[model samples]
Target: WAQSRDEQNLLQQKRIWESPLLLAAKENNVQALYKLLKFEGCEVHQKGAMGETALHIAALYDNNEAAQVLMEAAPELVFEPMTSELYEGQTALHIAVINQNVNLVRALLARGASVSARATGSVFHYRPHNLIYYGEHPLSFAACVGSEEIVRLLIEHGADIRAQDSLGNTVLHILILQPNKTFACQMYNLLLSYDGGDHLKSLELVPNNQGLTPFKLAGVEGNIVMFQHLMQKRKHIQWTYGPLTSTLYDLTEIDSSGDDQSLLELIVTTKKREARQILDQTPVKELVSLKWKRYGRPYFCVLGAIYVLYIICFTMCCVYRPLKPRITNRTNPRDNTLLQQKLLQEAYVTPKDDLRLVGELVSIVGAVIILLVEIPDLGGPFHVIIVTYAFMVLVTMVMRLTNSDGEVVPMSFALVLGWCNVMYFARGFQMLGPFTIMIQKMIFGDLMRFCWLMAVVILGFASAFYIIFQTEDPDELGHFYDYPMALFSTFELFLTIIDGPANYDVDLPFMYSITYAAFAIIATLLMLNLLIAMMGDTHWRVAHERDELWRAQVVATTVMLERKLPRCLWPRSGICGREYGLGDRWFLRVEDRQD
Candidate 1:
């Protein structure tokens, strides 16, 4: 072998891309291969001549001993290609199929082989009895070898049963016609029978180029057993002998294990071995289809109810806004001048991209939540969703901090909103109480109880601050728990807790002189002060606790109003408030043009 180039001297030191041990393995000297691997001088994972490693070839030869040797030296030799020519993209699986080595195939599968390996015609070469046989796929090779086990393996691992060979024939058509002298007619029939009843009928009808069916082939080859197996399943013998009827179902099924016995109860003799073999071929699902395979409909039904409540809540939000069309600035008396000024100064206007990305994160979270409901047994799915949420939140934080010029939403605001969502998720565990069908109800019960309390304190306070720290219209709604509500809706998880949505509906029933005096003071000091504060930068403070509390309560309020199911009087405007006759929504923005 010629010494390759780039023997770059001294400063670069020594470099060997192809280990000497790997080189020896490729040459097929078993002794040389063993020594190189044994000394730890060789890395079995090493590749040569187009990224083809030693393990890749041992699989190619269907050589178990070579694979065994490599494993002892280095256990983790993955099937990675170096050059485009290395096995012509043939996988270790393809080799196993062609060699008809079931045990070796099983071992390869266990050691992390890709089940999705597919081979191409130009790359693969095959022969039978020293004579070339083209049009070979893995299935074809398995069929030719009569390795029934390999065929089952291929199908179970998602192989395309409809795979066509070079001659445009499928494996089913070829398995019945291997031109060997030894195969019994009954064995070929049994092979066809393995695919179940329908295939057996087709095999008898197929006429080759020589005007011979599988039956004729059986008769010519003197395979009486195969003829007998064919006759047993479908007695349509007499293709030219004229139309036969009375194709009655056999009360006792046929077997295909090649055992020669009879199991007849009353009259007809049943071939036990032949009958058992035929029973082996049907897909397991064919026996029992529809409504019995799975038993989780009730869980999904509850999930559906939760989603409907969420939709109704969102719809009500739109209704109240449409009907009221808030005139807080001009009409609402005693406005807070200072709160208005503070909004003009420090109020965060969210950036479009940041908002869009956050929305995407919300949807991803929603999808994960749905998955959570579907597979409550799988704990890691929920963990993955939480981690992904944290990741997006971290990205949001980085964006906000890096925004020196304030090109995006401020990180503080994003953190407040994102963390608020985290709280809802934490608290939402209370919804698990509805999961009556849970496999481990007690375990989840304790977990949710802890979550409910912790979420109320941790998430509730953080969320409340997230809202209070912001200026007017915190979430584009009257500015309270707005984004979190939207996120909950996205996950179809709105209103999972809170018996009543904490809104303005609750009013004082009785007030004595002192009690009335406290109410009077609250209305005068708090409400009126809120109005006065709106006069300046502190205008947001004008919203008062009423607005803050009412925002979330309105979700519950909407659910009640929806029970009556009010329709939009003006359907064209799409308003659902008490009166849907509001004017065009976009007309309000006309004032911005004048500015």
Candidate 2:
């Protein structure tokens, strides 16, 4: 009897582990799945060889009943993340989302399954479609698959709309990356509709690990519609913190060596005149540089000033020789006076460049001497700026040496180097909380909203007038106008800037008066007043957020500046007599005491 019982238990274990569950789910045979669950000693939670439970397979098949049967028998299985078979590291909710089975997703959510469970690995053997999903939560997965209903359902069920996958992408960021325009737009609207998505606030700013915000991502993907959608959502949102990785100022400033013509064309065609507005609103890249801010801007700026003077003097020394004294004809009678006058006329050559050369030599030698300095990640993140600047310096040297009067070469170097300095200087303003918060909210914040809306109003009015007056001769309108006059006059008329059409009766007909009145009244009175309201609202936002915004900026700047300051000053320690103590303590002691 004991042997018989042991053999029966062995057979039951085999059936539980290697049961009819897999086949039942694929075939949508809930009855068979239920029968398998009812089998004596059968375990509903037992996973197959591929690490998938019956509920995972059922969700993949879009069989709500089979999934529920498995869940009802063993509700514990609903919370487990799938590791293999299909949709690895995903929950049954994710599978339902990928399958576009809204009802199944709804049922799964009703059971109180975890919503933000992430899929850290790619799905495989996915039968319903050939989607190659890697990682993201169900919400992001739903957005990727372009399922509006599922997205809505998940958000309604308290799914974290801000949840990021392993790639650090939020749902909106995922939407920006997709090529399916119609579906992307649908998911975008759906996500925005939910309060959990934080409406426009989340869409406007939150960045992933890669430091991409949805607004910049839309710009990057070159989708006109997506860009417009983001613009519309941008209104009435107050910005406080800055991006972690980079801002649009750094991203959009193009380099000549590479041709991202696609990106340029996107700016011209889609963003149009609104491109400048978009640019003005971009966060100042220097303010957001966590590493640099932690290094301390005051000190960094001082170091920066030193670097600039050193480079300028070094280049002058390298490129320009001293104007040698004119060796006059000493043999001539009047030679002494003429030579003396010529020498006076030509200025004396100062050792300024030579002194700079000495500083550079000391800096270089100091760096070499401090080789193998102890730090957690030695030789890493050190002098990226220095190396890049040196390359610029070297390229300029080559260009000028090869072609002495090459404005293109020296000009090119100055252009980039000047930009670097601009960024360094911008940090000084960024250091001020009131200034940064004011500029970010008043200039950049409202600027994006104002420009986009302003463009729409102008375009709509201009196109209307042009179509109405295209047939009119330029003679009746001042400056030989045609459709062009209508387009131009319409704008000037809108602003009430000037009499766009001088003496409508002299130039015109009664037929056109009504449209003109409406255009002027609507634009000049209504639109202008609305813009005033927007400006007022922006002012209050800045006022409310002033202290928090300013403190946040200062803290980030201080931490990043502090982190990199030791590294920044390590090599220069030799010059300050702190070669063994790492520089700042010794170099700053006198200044500290004086202060």
Candidate 3:
């Protein structure tokens, strides 16, 4: 992770280049870096494969002197972008600030480096400043490293204190994201001081991508000091109340088992003065209600039933339709004129007539109702699918089927409905959160690629057998008669699953024995191992992003819940809103208005 820019360039391209400045910076040889500066056409700004300049290499390696030499020679390079493709769209100044090169950071800034430049991708330095997930700013970068002085410098140079990163997090958010509380406290005050106490209202209320205001994030993390600090400035700070339908409403509490567990747990279980005092004054509004909680299961069941009805209707009307037996003069495909005449004559009872948009409308309405009333426990689109399944089932049942119609169509819907229930059951386990990420990462990252490789290999091997035995005893070997079964047998044989003497002699020709031996030794050993290796690599790669991924999943759950609610009754502002009082027939009144 700490490989030099030159070394990284080499690794990226699997080659090397003649770069004296880069090599000098890699070795931390300040004199050599200075010597390279004087050489004609030395291209002080020359870049490597990743578009990293010598200055970027210097910043990364913490070569303050070497960085100074480059800066003095070409001051404009101080602000030059490292190129979006090669160096994560960061400038040398961005790298310096991230690396905590305080002297170098000041030097670059003094040389007119813009404090507002953002990185296009995450960068590496002393610490992994995952700015891709974080907002890109020298101030935010400085704050992420818990550097008060660097932040102060950037602020004094007239940086936008209220500027948000890609994640919509202000400098204060980065401070909170940082683990060093001692530095975090100083930086928080510095940010507050810069924004001015009067503007804290504007600052603290600003929400991030998760829709979390700084105060709310403080509360979620159980950071009593952060919550107290933000609360002090914004007296009306309420973690549970904010602009409705914003990311704030889409916010979730940091799970105890999350990456911030230690911090979160300390905040939650603390009997400390800061937490106790501030929490008493801070109104942690209930995003969900007791009535909703108690009656949620029933509401979901009712909604689920409504979904089933819609699904049955949809299937009956749109998805499935048995040909009417009475229409014996149905279009003759071989005779175009007669087919046209027959289709025109029998158009009224056509399956197209069964189409009903009303069923789809009902499904949408049913889902909205469920989103409002039920405590949507599952995360991601899976929760949405779970709710939609019952409606899908409903759609299937509403079809106008003949008495002689086969059960296959409705049976398929039943199968889908069954699988949905299984997922819903999985959701109840809570362990689905992590496992879901793992499965998705595997599918998208490794499994899909593995399948593609396997498909090509299988096709290459299976084709030979298919062509050789297409007619002769081919059906008995299940190669031509049963194409899919033939593939399965090939795979089984590759794994040496077929091994009886009588079976080997009768099932395959002598020529196939050589192919089978090669497949078991070559395909089974190499391809199977390659698949396992891909999966294993993906497993660790996902583990690296688990915290960020889980945070996304939790945020996604909140967003899903937020989107499911009716417009007027969304969490932020409504009659029976997440924070509102319930009136007599509150749900009824809202539903009436909704209608």
Candidate 4:
């Protein structure tokens, strides 16, 4: 020990500054600690494998003299002790409370320890890889331990009482562990009375650890009060289609081992059904107005965001923006030819290139209007609007392929006949819609497959009749609208004479005119709409889904990188330096090898 021997002995030792020596000092085996510290030869501030210094461990167990010795040994030893507990797996503070060790508690407080920090931490970072912390700061841990002194200390240093646990348990759960239930309830109520426990702050953003939200967890746990607290922030997340309630409903009902319908219902029944109605209807307009106010009024950048989206989509279809040939004669005609050849080299196309580009352009225009102007949710298959346009474009392309000359007659003829058949069949079929198909698929084992076959047969009949019999010219066998008659009429429409149907052929001159009018309503009105809708789906991909991957990665990375301490040590595992290591491969990329 430095007390017995010359201090020069410590002045020449190596590995004296390491974690073992520090922990020994914290363990209060005085002689070994002094020898390691007395040595001025070592870096007195050396950390453990987890970056824990001697002072952190000393303060953990309330080794007062050891902490004082460490302070004298290295002034920086005033840093907080950083160790997790085994068994109930609390921190040293958590253990001190369960053991009722007041002296250790006081020492930890004197060293600037916190009482919060227990909800989230990386299991892999703990010693046994099962060790974890219990608070967002040290205050949370002390509160759970029921240490009034530690709580007071943390309050002086700014501890958040409403800090949520990793499992979404609040300080209220700590009361459940308290022996004096009445006083504990009083304390819990007292904490809740403060800003109603960070209620306004939580509205800005929910703390995310493993994608868990406090409201979502409260709902899952059937904690009606906490669920109400979470409802206060519902207005912040309206940009998403639905709130987290449905996800909780879905998760609670899933029978992992076996179904407990009662348990599912019990959890859902909390906070009453009225609360469900309110939380589900997000304040979309209110939030938008708030965001507009925050982002400031009528900025050109808002327009730029739309323009960027459109360009990304349009470029996918037509590189025509760069296609206009440039004629520049800056002293050499040869250079222009070289430039033209080079520029065209990267041009190539897959089947979807055109479709995707057009789709994106359309989507960009719509999205821009939504952001910069007002684009209402056009009801009843407005999806068909874009699809119909896409169909027209494709159909026109087909006609263009058939003739280079100025004749749009081919597609015009196809559209007229196709429209007539689609609408009439669709209308009649809608009237006779098979209820049996629903029951069969919903009940019978392979009935879904069987229904698909039926659909295919019906489609074949409709398509075949349209292609053959529904031509512009009138012909024999027009009375029968069946497939065989349709086939023969189509032959005549093509100017081919058919001799077989003598008796079956019915006289019908005005039939085509009557049917043509029906076709106009059904095909031009309905069928064209359907076609446009189908084609527009390709466009939706460019505009809507174009940056899906980018957006998700952005959200995930934002959540991880925004924290002061990395996610790895957020709640409990702050033994090291409260470093956050678990994030995306991109966000978690190692900046340098551990020293």
Candidate 5:
């Protein structure tokens, strides 16, 4: 009986409606809807699947007469939203606009439907997970579907165009996310022309949850046409007062100040090639240079001094350390070698070691401070290297304290990293900065590609040689006695350093000679020359925009160091760009372009 009752309830719920008025609205039967309204027990506010009411279904199916009858009976149903989760919070006006029934939309609005009503349901999400989404607003839906008449109607009825949706995306953001570029541009122009273009001007800078304003999103999406269209509005402002033109550029996107991330930082950090090209614009270069002169130079010098002090202390500890001789027996032949002698000189504590400990303590504290300061705003490959070096320094200090005997390897690595970290400071110099960038590009780009190619070539040749050189007597194989040895030997041959034995000694001399020759031509001749050509091309490409590249580097360095300082101290440090600007707006003055 319980199971039967459950089945009956399920069947009843599956039925479209429990109210005659709702059935009338769904069927567009105005007389039945009117007759049901006159009856006493007819629930006009009953909700069905997806929480849609009679009024919602009326608008969904474009039932004009039934919708008018329902609205006339209960005027508040116009603002009533669907209760179901998928279409939850969507009102009749949203349904009407989505259906492209302009007359129904106007009628609903005339009946006092909300223009500001947000669906706020998953079905209206901007992400691709939904079937239909229009930024959660009726106006957004109209604009998204290219219904200009409904859009204009909503706008004229006091719809807030700058209103953000669930994802903090404004109508402009929703428009940009549309697949139709021509439609988006048409809507963008329409929106721009409304209210004398002031609302659209303010809308361009409104960032979504991901911190992407419409202009920034255009660049990020590689929409060059839209990006340029938005760029023209914010790029500059000129007023002609009787032939003496005063030009002012809004540097809000280009300049980083008062906790705002600049467009340069955002675009440069992204992998988008098109967005990065915008950094080469003249105003961007000039802002970087200006910031460098005002803030970067002094901060860089101070940072360099701290690094140098740490290096000096670390060097003192390494230089003055006492070396203890090994306790091995004389009968051990390895102990007689010079290499063994150096290796056997283990580190030990002494009365003078306290001075070394003090220096090490200073180095450790300096490394910790630098790591903490840099880790928060870490950016780019060089920043990673610097952080890694600092971490290595900390590890070396711990090893020295815990196991002095095995500190050599870690200490050596830390020392090398410490010296290499100085390369980051080169960004302060115009000439050296581009040179460092070129080196980084070559290593990460060309050298990495070369390494991948060499791995495949070398591994193939190593395996072939290993198979051909297999023999009962290991001595007969020489460096090719094992697979690992064969692999190393193949690499050495590529470097022209293999001098172990002649190929004629091998049982498979023909195979050995031919394989070795093939490797020589492939790895040494072809791949090595390919790497050189790649590096040469990278050098030329970097050199072409050396100044712009260096300026970008300077901007990165400046922003990074500036971020390390306390917010309150920015004004005193004079690192804040806003301090130099006039009344909350940073503007660049330019002479007339005709000059």
Candidate 6:
């Protein structure tokens, strides 16, 4: 009985889903639409499953004549929104703008449609499930569509340029999010230049929910052209007398304080070449210099002292081990052997032993303290090396205390790593810093690729030689008796340590000679030269921006260490100071000189 009732209601809903007025609008029949409106109880506001009325259907299908008849009959449907899940709250104007029909948009707006209507539907949400999400406003739709005429019309009709959508994105934010660079640039210029600079300052300043204003978003996205244009918009003349033009720039994008977002932080964090170019601007360079002088210099000095102390103590612990000698016939004769054995059997712990134990304790404690301080501000590969060194120190200390024979291996590694970590302090000096960074970049970037290629070439040749040199007699097969041995021999050949074709007497001499020749040519000539070229390119690129890159490194280091300091100690550390302006407005006077 319930099944029959559900079927009956579904049929009734199907009947009301497509009424005569909606059918006329969908079919674009002007005569039928006019005649249907004159009939008794012929509803002009009847909706489909998506809650779209006759005017929405007319605008969607571009049935301009039928849209005119429907609006004349019932003007109330002009503001009505589709109430379905997919396109809920979108009126005919939203549909018209999306369709890019200028005539339909003008007609709807003339019929009293709201220019600022929002389409807060599922289709307009910024989720993976939905597809078409150009922030909910009609102006955003027109701007995203790259329709200059429609955007201008909407703006002239009193569309709010500063209006934010459900996701807090303004029309400018939506414009910047466009993937088409040409469209975004053209639309950005069109929107910013409308009505002789009415919406210039406020539109750029409006931030989204992620706290990124349009100008900052351009910087984050690495839109260099748009970033420069917005930078120009941020500058204005505070006062000018004669040839001296004192311009004030809004430094909100460049000046960061206490973890706030800034243009310098964004560009530095991204590390893109395009964004890095902006760091050479006069204002940004000045800010970096000021920050380094104020915060980085003092912090670097204290950090350098602490690191030197840690390295000294860690080295001493590894070096100062108690020595035990053995008496042997090779060193002493039979008569003196007994005396030497008796003397060695008597062991004594001196004050030097006590000092060694104290040094070990201090080194272990220093490793722990460095790890705790550096973990929160971990940024570069050096920080990772620091972590690995600390682990090595702890493991070595454990093995040494337990009287394990394997303590030598970890101790050697800890000693080398402790010294290698001094490269972290090299970033403070101008002469050593960029050179170190260049070497690091080449090692990780070019050298890593070279190693991978060499591995492939060596592996291939190793397998081929292993198959060809296989024989029943083990000695006759030379080093190619096993796969691992073949691999090691091939690697030795690559290093030019062993002669390949001359040393190995194989069953198939031709195949072995050919494989060895190929490996030599590829690994030695091709791969080695390629690595040099790659490193040269990297060196040139890094050298071009040496100063800016080093300054960026200092900024990151200062910010990371500053965050870990106590608030009360900030003043004493000479890091944080008072602001230079009233309220939140600060100004800088740059002398304009044309060359």
Q: Write the per-residue lDDT of candidate 6 for residues 1-595, one digit (tens) a residue.
A: 4455356446435644457777777788888876777866576678775677888878877878888888888889998998876677899999889889988889888987898878887668887655546898888899898788999899888888778988788888877666776667778877766533544566676788888888888877677667766678676676767677767666656666426565666776775666666655766665556656876677787878888787887787666655655445545553434322212222346556667667877887877876786675513777888887888888876775466646677778878887887877888787887766666666766777767877887878888888877744445547677789889988888878886645434454567767777778876786568756785664555557665566667666765655566666443221221374333545455667443
The top-ranked prediction according to TM-score is 6
Candidate 5 positional error at 66, Å:
12
Tell me model 3's lDDT, rounded to 2 decimals: 0.55
Residue 11, candidate 5: alpha-carbon lDDT: 47
Instruction: Give the poorly placed runs of model 4, Cα more than 4 Å off.
Output: 1-20, 39-42, 59-62, 80-121, 124-133, 161-187, 196-216, 222-595
- Candidate 1 lDDT over 405-500, as tens digits, reads 332333333333333333222212323322211322234544464445434433433354334424443223232345565234212212224232
For this target, which candidate reaches the highest lDDT against the unseen true structure? 6
For each candidate, what is the lDDT? 0.40, 0.55, 0.55, 0.40, 0.71, 0.72
lDDT of 5: 0.71
The TM-score between candidate 5 and the true structure equals 0.66
**Model 5, 1-595: lDDT tens per residue?**
4465356446434645565666677789887776777865577787766677888878877888888888888888888987765666789998889889987888888887889887876556656555555778788889988889999999888888888887888888877767777767878878756644454557766788888788767766656567656766764456776656666666666566435455656755667655655655555556665656776688788878888777878878777655555445554574435432223334454567778777878878877987997786512666677677778778876765465556766777777778777777887776687777767666766677767877778788887877876844555656677788888888887667766347464465567768767776786676667766785664556556565566666666776766656655434221233566445565776545444
- How well does candidate 6 score on lDDT at residue 389? 82
- What is the lDDT for 123 in model 2? 37
User: Once superposed on the true structure, which residue ranges of model 1 sit more than 4 Å away at CA?
Assistant: 1-52, 60-62, 69-87, 100-102, 112-116, 121-130, 134-136, 148-160, 184-595
Over 338-399, each residue of candidate 4 has an lDDT whose tens digit, in order, gives 43211222234635545654553464444344334322320112223333433443554454
Clashes of each: 47, 11, 28, 36, 2, 1
Question: Could you tell me every candidate's TM-score relative to the true structure?
Answer: 0.28, 0.39, 0.45, 0.29, 0.66, 0.71
Of the pair 1 and 6, which is ahead by TM-score? 6
TM-score of 6: 0.71
